[PDB]
């Protein structure tokens, strides 16, 4: 699982 | 920007 809010 | 990989 990978989540990124950049 | 938003990246999501379940």
Residue numbers in the entry:
A (entry chain B), B (entry chain A): 1 to 6
Task: Quote the authors verbatim.
Our results highlight the dual role of short aggregation core motifs in reversible amyloid formation and receptor binding.
Four polymorphic crystal forms were grown from solutions of APRTc5b. Aromatic side chains form a cluster in which acetonitrile or ethanol is also present, while TFA forms multiple H-bonds with termini and Trp side chains. As the concentration of EtOH was reduced from 30% to 10% in the crystallization solution (keeping all the other parameters identical), the entire cross-β scaffold rearranged from parallel to antiparallel relative orientation. In polymorphs A and C of APRTc5b, an acetonitrile/ethanol solvent molecule is incorporated in the aromatic cluster, leading to somewhat larger ring-to-ring distances as compared to those of APRex-4. In the presence of organic solvents, the exendin-like structures adopted more compact crystal forms, in which opposing side chains of the steric zippers interact with each other.
